[model samples]
Target: SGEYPTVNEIPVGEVRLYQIADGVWSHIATQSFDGAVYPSNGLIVRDGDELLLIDTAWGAKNTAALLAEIEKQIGLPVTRAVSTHFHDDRVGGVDVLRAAGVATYASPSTRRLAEAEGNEIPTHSLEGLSSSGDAVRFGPVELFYPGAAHSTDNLVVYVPSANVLYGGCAVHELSSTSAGNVADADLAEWPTSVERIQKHYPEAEVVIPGHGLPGGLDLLQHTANVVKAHKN
Candidate 1:
């Protein structure tokens, strides 16, 4: 269950917003696989009068809907965005953000991977961020590449002001007893990556996984355990 109070929910549209902290929200979007929809979580962090979106919906249409609702109800336009990795659930809205003229950032590797995969690419490169502790800041938000986990180019976002860690697809939700999807995963390195995340953001009070309900540091530990249990 979501520990955070839901700010709003769009049940039919498959989008939900939960207020994890003051001025920090988790935006949940979903996509269908074999007719079963699964949730993917993104972040909305306020930076001054505007907002920053971390990751995106599975595609442009859903992303557009998420953006529209944010603007219409949340009353803040996303001026910047970051694709935490090359996955569709993360970078699928790059094209939508591009059309809306929002500045987008992603690790160079992410851009390269997305480009090679024919997925939409971010507009700007988050230069020199490849290893653990390599981080770039945009106002109150920080993006850190904690090595490779679910995906080779995967990264995590942090908002120090809110003590929130948007762990993207790297940290597993507590409900995830096993690694959900490994199609593009680096299983051998995942546990180490999770370790680095815990090392770098030990103070993270709220942890938001890529999908499902958010939890605390337990999510990080759970992810490491799950990966270690299955990586072999």
Candidate 2:
């Protein structure tokens, strides 16, 4: 909702673009959150005829804008979508997408958690990439779960063609000093989770976080250390 300040890169404001590769992009939205407002990231991937979205905006209103922007930039309708976890920011636009008949998918746990939290669950639920332990393809995007660092159902999306990983809110940026918003975090097993992620994708060219700027493997290392500190 507009209850929070929604930012896009218009005139260097809140929204911005993280240029991934091969003309693909990650939409970054900065809204009033965690007291100072952190960035929430989503990805747009071209499947075949239609594009696939990684996550929706913070709310339905912003999600509509996000889809419109993507349509304007890429000239393709979002045919399918996926939520990385069970948080509102991750799948806040379920109703909007449902109304538009866009197919949505989420991890089984994510679906359960989201439903329990009283949010509209995704249109579909599947096993997370975590169980496969291989880069499972979801339409044009590949996904895998590193571990439950930030949330129990956190799953990161990997773009093999672009070497870009949508780490969702489960992973933090290098610039951050702690495991943020641990209200839903599994601190006891967070570090190991990042380690799994690092091992899975050491060559990730660009690691996109749920909030803040994307980096490489350093983000995973930094996150591990931050959680280590949180543990200590």
Candidate 3:
């Protein structure tokens, strides 16, 4: 088994920064609703001289704060962004990224879905499947579309060098007892989608979901079981 003992979790304004491994960062958006602290997660990859961010918080103000924090910590500016899906947690800060000249990328289908939902879309588009199993790569990061599990355009990103995975909303925390917000999820295919992740990233040491704390491979199996429990 692999371990990330040096992982660091830092709080910045309304967001959190989690370091999974060298050059692998998770931007966590925290919000208090109904007297509970809820989280929305994103990713950041250090790509040589530049940085690539996957997803964003739910709005402009939060994104700006993180932009400053990343530059200050990593000493590099984010040059690109990828929205994992159309949901606000993933694309909400797109405008902020674009305004700062960050090239945002998303699948065309994701763009259409966001448009129909009247949500903010990213700056660029990604075509075709990933190098393997519907995953797409930009720099060292691979974004996988394992079919409509969490949402019609859900994506799971992988960092090969660090063996880290950002499962986005398609995955769930180990503590999660349900499939989570199935209003847009394809319950029938949810388990299979995550199983695809298991097939591709058998050695993933660090696994992060869209919400809640990041964990190990147990999250993948835990999510699959959650969906199975909900399958009618």
Candidate 4:
């Protein structure tokens, strides 16, 4: 319908549906995180009647199409939405779900930062929701906010059912390992935060980052090392 193909037009549903193991499936959004140019990543995990969405795309248009595709494939509505950070590329489309009456959630600080920045950082308000430290539940998916790296409010979502970790913008693929743009990064705290992720989800065999393809534990370790090496 626009310059970018709609989710229904793309083969994303087929390519992204990876059966990591048992009843777990990792839906990855293979896009760049550079908000100045392209779209960021987004993911969804279906468990029972509820679906957990990780990071809305770039804008309401993109996110609305994504939600439509989810319904088309899984026939389940999004019961909850999780914002990995306050970046516009990640949370810009929040109003789409908010208008749909879907409950949105994020880390306490993330929510606060979202409000503080308002439309300056993203296009939505962080009000009318619950926030927390790390572990949050939406059906079978449990998100662990280890700490922060790429952004001070990054929330890493982990699905115990599939033993997969959704390492938001904090961790991308090896190809994107360059030191990220520092508009909102905590480089010094990045290493320890990733370490906390490793400690918490040691059993995670598959790591689905906010951008790029789904990878293995090696990806997480690589990201941790990169952050540590570049720590200022």
Candidate 5:
């Protein structure tokens, strides 16, 4: 049985997985931290007949392997994908997933950002499927987005079952709160965003950062403190 490990290496870098709960997982592209052309983190949830993926890596190779892994583990096809933000690292694999007949979704702001930035946003050429609230459902799994931090279009996915929060680049377990690029950060609103997460999941015990390792509640507090300590 191929269980989900903490890190899986790819040609570019590595893919790290954090178990959000029983059947929910968060996958982060380790390459993102190196300031590569396209780097991203994603979430995967297994729900009976289908699997849901969030934020396709950065290219076709990355997304294809991810889909293969989902099929291998879940014994089902990936039915849906969500873009956490509009950056290429996050949405670069949109075309590949779409070609697989998977429905791709994004926040309204994410879609708009993709449109405005075009290829500059990574997967701009791929048409988006839908946009709505932070929350998206695929069978039994539910993903929630509190607000924005790293970017105005940033989205956070929470697995209520696991009490784990996937803080996409908007938040991290390590010292740095800023994602690779911070040209569009809402630094002033970052603290409030962390508060929203805490308020939403008062019992959350784990945090799957968009980069770095999956950590305990201390990571959450660390993130809050970092955002609070560094205000631009």
Candidate 6:
């Protein structure tokens, strides 16, 4: 439905990879919840000679498959990774990344919350990301914490070179009518966070949500609207 095309499909985890930009790809992994299946999104970007992963697949096994596919297709090992939040869908494969000798990163708050939840913590903390304007750069990619929205430690990753923003769960897909999971959300601050991202990366042409297809700036406003509607 979007401009990106599916590059590969691995049956091991029902993982599908889509080429979003010149050197950026988005991968979706499916997981079963209460007998229903759901797809979660992550991003892979080729930076210099190494690959950077935005989030892991649903779980360790799926992430293992994803890494293998990356090596097989991209011909580059993931040197670094970042979890957008503390949720399992974001960091579930941290152990796999660690085992593969990939340095995984997370915000300090994300580390604390993930530690509290007993999920495998990221190997490194981005640290010092305060508001939307604050950003930590890793080569050509940028990770920003726009306050709390989808999760207390939710982060949005931006690739200026590609004009793609990996919004994670902070921004919703245009088709998503309701906020997916609000257990860790700050409803009152959600709209503000979205606005911060929109203004911060005004040139982001492709905004990839944590699930479903990607869109543009509309996705940011769509998420804010969803939160507002949910609040009522």
Best by lDDT: 6
**lDDT, candidate 1, 83-185, per-residue tens:** 9999888888789888998998888999999999998999999886876668888777888888889998998899999899989888888878889888999
TM-score of each: 0.93, 0.88, 0.90, 0.78, 0.79, 0.94
lDDT of 4 by residue, 1-232 (tens): 2232223434322223434555454443323343333324566776667777777755666667667767776677787777778776677778887887667766556767877887313333333223324465656677666666888777787788778788878886776656566578888877788888888888988887666666788777788777777663
Candidate ranking under TM-score, highest first, comes to 6, 1, 3, 2, 5, 4
Q: Give me the runs in candidate 1 sitting further than 4 Å from their true place.
A: 1-13
Model 5 reaches what TM-score against the true structure? 0.79
- lDDT of each candidate versus the true structure: 0.85, 0.77, 0.81, 0.66, 0.65, 0.87
Candidate topping TM-score:
6
- Name the lDDT value of residue 170 in candidate 3: 89
Could you tell me how far off, in angstroms, the CA of residue 98 lies in candidate 1 after the best superposition?
A: 1.1
Which candidate, 3 or 5, has the higher lDDT? 3
Candidate 4 lDDT score at position 88: 67
lDDT of 5 by residue, 113-187 (tens): 887887323332222313223455545545565565777767776766777677787777564554445677877
Candidate 2: segments with Cα more than 4 A from true spot: 1-15, 33-36, 128-135
Cα lDDT of model 2 by residue, 1-232, tens digit:
2222224433222344455787568886655555565558788888877888888876787777777777676787888899988887888888898788799999888899999999878988866354535456787777787667788888888888878877888778877887778889988788887777888887788887887777787888788788889878
Clashing pairs in 6: none
How many steric overlaps are in each model, in order? 0, 3, 2, 1, 1, 0
Which window of 10 residues has the lowest lDDT sum in candidate 2? 2-11
RMSD (Å) per prediction: 2.6, 4.3, 3.9, 5.5, 4.5, 2.5
lDDT of 3 by residue, 29-100 (tens): 664444654667888999998999988876777788879878777889899999988887788778888899
lDDT of 6: 0.87
In angstroms, give how far residue 32 of model 5 lies from its true place.
6.9
